From a paper:
Bacteria use sigma (σ) factors to recruit RNA polymerase (RNAP) to promoter regions of genes that need to be transcribed, with 60% bacteria containing at least one specialized σ factor, σ54, responsible for transcribing many stress response genes. The σ54-mediated transcription initiation requires specific AAA+ proteins (ATPases Associated with diverse cellular Activities) known as bacterial enhancer-binding proteins (bEBPs). DNA looping enables bEBP hexamers to engage and actively remodel the RNAP-σ54-DNA closed complex to convert it into an open complex. In this work we capture intermediate states of bEBPs in facilitating DNA opening and partial unfolding of σ54, and therefore link the ATPase activity to DNA opening and σ54 remodeling, which eventually lead to transcription activation.
Author numbering:
A (entry chain C): 1 to 1341
B (entry chain M): 106 to 257, 259 to 292, 333 to 403, 415 to 473
C (entry chain D): 52 to 101
D (entry chain D): 253 to 503
Write the structure that this text describes.
Amino acid sequence: MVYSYTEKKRIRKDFGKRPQVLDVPYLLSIQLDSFQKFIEQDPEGQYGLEAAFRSVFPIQSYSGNSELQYVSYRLGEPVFDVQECQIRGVTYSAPLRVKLRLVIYEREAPEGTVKDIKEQEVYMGEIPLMTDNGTFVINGTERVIVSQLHRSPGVFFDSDKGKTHSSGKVLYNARIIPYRGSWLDFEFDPKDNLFVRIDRRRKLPATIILRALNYTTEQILDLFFEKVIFEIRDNKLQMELVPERLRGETASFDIEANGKVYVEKGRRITARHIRQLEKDDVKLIEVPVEYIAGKVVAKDYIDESTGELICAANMELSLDLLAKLSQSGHKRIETLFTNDLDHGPYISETLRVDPTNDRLSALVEIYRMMRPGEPPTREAAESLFENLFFSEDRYDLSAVGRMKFNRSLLREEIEGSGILSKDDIIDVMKKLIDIRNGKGEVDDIDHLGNRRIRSVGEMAENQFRVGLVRVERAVKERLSLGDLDTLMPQDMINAKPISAAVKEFFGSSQLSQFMDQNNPLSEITHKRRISALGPGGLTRERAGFEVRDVHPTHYGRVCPIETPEGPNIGLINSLSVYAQTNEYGFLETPYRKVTDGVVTDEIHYLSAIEEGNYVIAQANSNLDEEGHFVEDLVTCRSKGESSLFSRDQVDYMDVSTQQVVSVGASLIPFLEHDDANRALMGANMQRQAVPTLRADKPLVGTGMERAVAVDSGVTAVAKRGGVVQYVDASRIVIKVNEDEMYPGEAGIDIYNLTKYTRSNQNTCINQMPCVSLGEPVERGDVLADGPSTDLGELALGQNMRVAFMPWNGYNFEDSILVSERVVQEDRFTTIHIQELACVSRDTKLGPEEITADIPNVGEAALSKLDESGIVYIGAEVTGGDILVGKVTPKGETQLTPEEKLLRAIFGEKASDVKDSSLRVPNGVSGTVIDVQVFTRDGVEKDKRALEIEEMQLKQAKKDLSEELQILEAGLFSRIRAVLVAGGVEAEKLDKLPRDRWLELGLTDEEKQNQLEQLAEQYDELKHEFEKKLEAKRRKITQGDDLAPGVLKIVKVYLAVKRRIQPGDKMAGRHGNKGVISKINPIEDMPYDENGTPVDIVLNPLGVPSRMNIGQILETHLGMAAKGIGDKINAMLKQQQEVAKLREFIQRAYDLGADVRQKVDLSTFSDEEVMRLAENLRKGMPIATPVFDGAKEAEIKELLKLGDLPTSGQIRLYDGRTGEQFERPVTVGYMYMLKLNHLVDDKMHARSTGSYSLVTQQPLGGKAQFGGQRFGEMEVWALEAYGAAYTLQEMLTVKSDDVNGRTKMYKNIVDGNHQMEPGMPESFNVLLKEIRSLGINIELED
Amino acid sequence: DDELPVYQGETTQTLQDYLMWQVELTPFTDTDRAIATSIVDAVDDTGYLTIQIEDIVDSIGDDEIGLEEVEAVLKRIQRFDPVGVAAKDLRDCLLIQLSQFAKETPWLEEARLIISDHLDLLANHDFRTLMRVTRLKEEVLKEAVNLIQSLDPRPGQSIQTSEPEYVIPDVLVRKVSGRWTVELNALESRNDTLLRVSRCIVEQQQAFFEQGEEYMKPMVLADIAQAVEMHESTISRVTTQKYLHSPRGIFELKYFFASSTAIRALVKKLIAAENPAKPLSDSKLTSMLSEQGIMVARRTVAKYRESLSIPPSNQR
Amino acid sequence: ERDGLFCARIFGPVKDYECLCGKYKRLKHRGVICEKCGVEVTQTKVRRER
Amino acid sequence: VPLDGGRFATSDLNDLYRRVINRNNRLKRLLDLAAPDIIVRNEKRMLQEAVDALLDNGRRGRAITGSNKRPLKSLADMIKGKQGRFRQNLLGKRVDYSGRSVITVGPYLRLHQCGLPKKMALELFKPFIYGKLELRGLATTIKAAKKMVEREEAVVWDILDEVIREHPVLLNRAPTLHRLGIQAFEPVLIEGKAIQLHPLVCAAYNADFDGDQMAVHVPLTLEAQLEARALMMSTNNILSPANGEPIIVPS
DNA sequence: GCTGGCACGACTTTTGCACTCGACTAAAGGGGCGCGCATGCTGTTG
DNA sequence: CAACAGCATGCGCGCCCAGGGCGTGCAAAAGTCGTGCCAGC
């Protein structure tokens, strides 16, 4: 495929057998597409700002006849760039402006409108935009906003699993969940009665909520039950037959159907006697009277003459009633069915418990029920009733709620209003009773069908709607008798609630957090994370153990391996590779479509509900050129299960094997051989690695590294490419091809790389150019590498020659011994940049000034400062050297001889000023890499504040001058081209610049055309470019927006290189971790017969118990990987011909079964091959994808080509004794990391420090110098030893005994070592705090 | 409560705390520790001042305990961490700070003892006649004086005042057309409305006093009490609590409610050329003010120019 | 504020042997009380007892 | 609870006292006014609510505030908390002359010993050092001593050795489950930032070397030192005082 | 005889002092669990 | 129709962080600017 360019600098070798279909996606995409849909104009109105405008507008005021409306929004352009904005510490956002039409109408005049007026735009707030990479810069910090996965709106059902009543039942409760509004949850009693809860309220009867619907009891029972019939005329007593309505009963008498007995008394009820009466046509028949005594009347029945009193409803009929209804002359009687097998007599007992079935009594009952105390006002009832659900905006379940509400009840229409209705709640009660009847099951809450993701679009839209309603309840007051000032869309709108709400969200919020900036892969995995926590739900500690577990629908949606191992476990998950999300917020995952038994290359994204209906094959399975499965029985998934099916049954297939695994784990070689928990650690550990000075490409890897690097957006990637004009460390320009260009802009593309820059985790970000010079580049090729990147691959650690074997106990337990070589060669050396800021501000006593000079301070200390008082760039600073000095004046020192004497002798030395300065924190170190110094407008800063002014100005002028040199070169080419036609002076034209003063008039055509175009374009480009330089110049000389109580601002950056020591906390991809126990000299290590010592020695005994065998296979293939590079090393070092080198690399790439990577040489020729070979001199980078990876067999094969022993073990020699170890040993390259845990950050130690005002105990932690909690278990252990003195000095003397700490330390200094214990403060306190209740507690002698 | 970082405290150390810590650790007797504790409280955040000695002696209530006992102990206390501590008068401060020069300092020991012990009162102005007193000449004396001027004063190294006590402003005065326009930057609701009315009174003050003019135009609280009809004490309380913020000369505005301030500005102008005469002439300036129409007659308006740490009187 | 939470008088002084009202400032007296206020000197650890 | 810019803000417990005082003064004012029983009645109600809210913010519902709310805390909550003055005074003092670092292996270094990082002692032993310095006569005054150990040159490391000699230290780890979980050792100074722990005791501590961290504490006095030698040194207890069978067993 | 500091006066600034209840319309949360003790309604013993 | 015993529902313990977050007059008394007087150089 000829690849592209940088890829041809090093090609990894692919061992993956299965071909790929769907390319891995954008990864980040889930952030962008969210917020890209939140900022859009939409005609339909939903999806982003439009929806919050339409959520309110238009506003009606109060019977005003005048209103207000709005039209779109639009935007502004952001004032600062992302880098500027990040430096200055300003939040990165943009103006939101909206045109609101105002309509003013006359009173008492219907439909008449007197006038209308609208402001061009009103400016409301600034919405923060999003960078290209997925972060919102906010007060010069990145901050990723985390996606959340919440219980979806719609109708839900629950069995309770009968774990309450201790008898056991099935208690079926249904909750309705809106997008915003109240909750309705119907439940069952132990006695089997439905109850209504509203917002977790004590249970109410069932038929009151239904009684609010203007339904009479007749309509209640007739609507919620069967009709059937019963008829008795002159004691004929013929009832309608319902054989299909009953599956059983006990017959008390012989049932005769049309002069023939169908079923005798006690005869079989089985389907024989049923179909026997079915096939035969039978009308209404007579039954025994005693059977009716159990039936209950339905409709209200009254005599024709008198309609008084008895038998309204829900009354078991009596023998007294038969005479009355029979004498009344009613032929037909409609009664309830109620035969209990599936069916049940519910909702009738609810009527029994219901105190009154009247509407008004129910509304008053609920109205008085909501708030505990309430008067029966009757208005609360009408208000809350319509309000709590049927208001336009009060309760809204929205589109997910409505859709899933439709599919939950099996409605055909998927569209509807966002508010409930009578038939809605009635149908919910119908389905609820239906679940009790045995027909229908429950829903799994864990199912991903029932769990939806919200991303930053949807959440920002929420808070923006909130913020907008809080404005509208105010703006409603302008037309409220606020009368008329006209000019409405200017003073009426207050932007403060909108802005404070939006920047309140992004600022502070559980789901906006500081981004993990160590690693690219940390960045990535932060920005695709799905949290269950937050605003929308899962308070944790109370969540329970079931949302922790992997459910079978997480199949290629979340990940089963990447999860925090800490006490939020299964809570915070990570998107799987190829996962995406719907318009409805549900996780869907791709599959190849299989028609007949051939696999079509069309892919379909299936949602978790859609997925279970079908059959889906296995990621890794066989296949043919034709596309038929090799094996006739293929392992597949159906529904919650897996098993073998026939060839013709399965319609889908998994695309790639990467589907189950997340990107984090998609990086780990040999992940099969690893146990899942141990895999689970190592996935987490590659995040907390730390990029080192030189980035080594991993020598064995999955193939995934190109994506992550270039997606993470830490690399500099070339747009619209072409040949490289200019190169350098900080800057890289590309002269683009003539093909891709916008006409009239012309020009080239420039890239300014970012040099050393703190990250949120105080680590370096550094870009270093990959490309050379005079080299062609296409779009997508990487120009620079960010930190922990090599030529577009993700390189988080280093490769190390590992030997497995115990070595003198130094590698014991999980520790780890390393050759001094490693420390000399500086792999694992990592930079750290730390920020410190000084700010100079106005006090009550007057302004504060920075430096030159200070009271009571030596010249010694001041030697590293400048004329202006900031430290010279370049200084080495340690300990409490003064980084910026500053003076704070005190009050009014006047007179008396001593004051006048000190002022006379020393010149007062600026007198009242104090020593307040920016001294370095004690125990910190490092050179000063950069100083910023933001100032105030009109302070007249002068001094050295201007050096950054001139510096940035020269950089800007130099960057703009390039386009003027190239465009002026083009104009000079046109002028030089036109002068050739006539009046050509040749060299004389070149030696005479500035048009040769137009070179007279030449021809009239060249006069007017050449002088007009040349002079016009020349003066327009000169004046326009100078105008850009004047605008930028005005942007440079100014001062920032700033607090009223701050005058000028200075910040200093420091850098330290930190060198590995025996506190390293090194790890590997395979869940391997340790410390560095010791650094050995080089001669003390084990070495092979050629004298090459292993770098780093690790303890075999790790490996069986933990069952992570990725480690071992990694080593072996690593071994074999170096081997090839050793062949080539040795080959190029002997000055071999290009042809033979080509032959051995070609012969290397093509080894293995299958392996799908067809690269071959002869396509690229002469150099290009020498290039790569020199690029792979240090090892050949073999790449084994996740579950299609390299087999042992292929590893031994690869390894025999390197003249290495097939077993991967080798004889090694002791380094001290020179003696061979008995037994061979595995040696191999394994690829290590250094984790962000360093002991420099850990070792604390205090003796005596500052205490706490109350309780008078030492302070909490390091940095503040904690002392070290000695907690209750630790006391228990001493008591258990019976050592009561040690315990007694802990409790007292060395924590809260104040007099006794002093006496203690004074005796120690004197050599007494005696205690003199007293009474600890904190007891005294307690006695006061109990005296603060009316209890005395006193100590009695 | 606990388990959180409640603002329980820091327990920092001042100078007296630290001195007392230093006394705890030194071989004082039972009595001498009482004299030491008696002196360290007498010490000030400024160092040097140990206030009156004979009140230190008399504060103990006789019963023996002479002056010499407090004197010796006093010296030893004067010797603790910040070098010269306490003592009195700055003279003995510089003699204790000069007590340790290592004695290997060339020319400095002797000369420094003569200059610092005695005659240092005349070293204020310059050398001059003192050069004839000690017979020294050229840079021999100037280098010793370089050392004396290199000493610093007392303590104020312990300090423990990291708190700058910032202003935080309250209401911002965005400068308009050579003046100022309010914007207010940065029951309980009734108190907030009262604060807004105080900002409105500050805006009225903008109308009450010219910004561009020297100092501020004279105004009475009866003007702000005339505008909103509020009581004087209430307005003065709002302006006393909150502090108005302006781009230039921002202040609580409590002093903003052209009077004496204009005279102070005139005094500052007189001070600029007042350098030529050390004695100064506020009384002559008062005569000039009377000629200008002020009618000042050696009044405190002139005296204020002659006060406020002016060269006037002090130079005389 | 006088007669309030936090107040001098009851609850003791603020600075060690220095008290509000600016009189009998230090160590002149083991106890004493001003004429302006009830300030009882003696140390200020008494904010932890009274 | 003093603020960032000055202008102290009221603590949590103060609000309860302010409230009670407001209702007490208002009930007193309306009580001395001789007014109807309804409004002073509602004032009696309001004040019992107020005092009952200052003693326990539970008892009934809501309590809290409009501050972001939360129950606030009361004088009851000032006690009986999972972490409180009672918990702080109960087995739980936070503590002095202590420090903490990462563990490495000890693979020479006999049982009763313990690799203690050079830099880290020198702190733990400060008082002790100054004593020695004043004895030898290298410092006449406390400030001198202080300054030489601040400058940390030369004699001081030499004296550190002399200080540490035979002075038992005690190490402690993490969940302390049984009494073995803290034990006492003779330190041996070692340049490094980490603590070397002999293998054999890794059992007891339940510690591997994957980034576990130990605290260290310094017994002072005499009694305490002897209780460390004759009770907590690792060479006293080799047998597990549960089952009785040896710990120390080689793994 | 002139300048500076302080004392006396006027002014104009500071300070007295508080009760009604004011309220005000929503603002949301929200997947543990055991365990026990007491109050209350039901039920059966005579 | 009486008191007595039992079943059940509700309420309060535990575990455990978790994070911060924070106007309306008039009137009596007093602070200060102005002016004059007295003392120092």
